[PDB]
Design a protein around this ligand. Sequence first.
Ligand SMILES: O=C(O)c1nc([C@@H]2CCCN2C(=O)Cc2ccc(Cl)cc2)[nH]c(=O)c1O
Ligand SMILES: O=C(O)c1nc([C@@H]2CCCN2C(=O)Cc2ccc(Cl)cc2)[nH]c(=O)c1O
Ligand SMILES: [Mn+2]
Ligand SMILES: [Mn+2]
Ligand SMILES: [Mn+2]
Ligand SMILES: [Mn+2]
Lengths: 177, 177
Amino acid sequence: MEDFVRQCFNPMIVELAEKAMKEYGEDPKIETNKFAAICTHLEVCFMYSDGGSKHRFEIIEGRDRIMAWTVVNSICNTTGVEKPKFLPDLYDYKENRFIEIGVTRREVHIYYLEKANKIKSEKTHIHIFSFTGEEMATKADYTLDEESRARIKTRLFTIRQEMASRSLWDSFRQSER
Amino acid sequence: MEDFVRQCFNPMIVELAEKAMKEYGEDPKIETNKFAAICTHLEVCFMYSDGGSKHRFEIIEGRDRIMAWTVVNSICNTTGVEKPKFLPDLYDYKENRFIEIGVTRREVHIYYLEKANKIKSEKTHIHIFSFTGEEMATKADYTLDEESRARIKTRLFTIRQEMASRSLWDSFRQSER
Ligand SMILES: O=C(O)c1nc([C@@H]2CCCN2C(=O)Cc2ccc(Cl)cc2)[nH]c(=O)c1O
Ligand SMILES: O=C(O)c1nc([C@@H]2CCCN2C(=O)Cc2ccc(Cl)cc2)[nH]c(=O)c1O
Ligand SMILES: [Mn+2]
Ligand SMILES: [Mn+2]
Ligand SMILES: [Mn+2]
Ligand SMILES: [Mn+2]
């Protein structure tokens, strides 16, 4: 499964995911399922920022903490949106709202509630994807057009199928907590 | 002039420029002209990666060293372009070449020769801009359309004029070495 992650995600995603695990004292060579999960969430974030206009989305995830907070504070100073308590994943210029992105192997609506009851931010939007293609977001607002969204689930499904082809999906489907 | 830099470039550029100076033991509060010069070169790089298609350009400048080399090595492994000796500023997918970007207050052709005689990379392209609007590149190839290029010189001219309005341009025009 370690080899699979490296042959599945581009090297910039791999590097980003290892740094994040090491920053928390976890070994990518060992927590291979968390490894893959960080990569997938990272790749989905890059794809969300790709739908819509060329500059619709400022991306927060994947930057070091200092730059990440530099972006968010800069947006709050210019537009006046409330400053989130936690680093969210993107900013949506067209709609004036921070976005949180979740990717779960579990059921989509439970993960919604989990990250709703902990976000406590009125003006931060939650958008959740599954590998089985069930997506769940806030106030029934899903931001991107069905076409951008479809490309993301298709990518997520494609990951699922090759993990299964290498017989990794079952263990990857249990590890989540 | 310190205040001018902060009121002229977006906070992400300021932060990036301070980190680079501190990484070399220079004080942004003191070397205020180098400060502005790092910011301008950074902003021009972001604008070059903006002309052309949405994904024409992979950007190298502005990333930490590890990620920066992660990008370049990843490109060389996939396409087979020669691996540069120094970190360049962008990659051009449409043309299969690394780009170096220079911004000078001095004369454009001298800076071309300076960064040609030190690059020693056959397959790295040099593109130089001035605040007075004179631009100079390799093999007379200038990559972007006249329209993207014009927007960059217009921005550069606009910087020059407000430095002059605050009477900073003359000292900023001498400091370069
Ligand atoms: O979408 C999500 O679930 C999501 N969750 C997080 C959680 C909560 C804050 C810390 N954290 C980590 O994951 C850091 C970490 C990274 C690697 C390991 Cl081994 C362990 C932890 N942070 C997000 O930015 C985010 O988008
Ligand atoms: O375009 C250019 O002139 C250009 N020049 C450089 C030079 C050569 C390599 C180091 N360096 C610095 O500037 C680091 C530095 C940053 C701040 C201070 Cl205070 C001093 C030095 N590096 C580029 O990436 C680049 O694009
Ligand atoms: Mn995040
Ligand atoms: Mn997230
Ligand atoms: Mn550079
Ligand atoms: Mn440069």
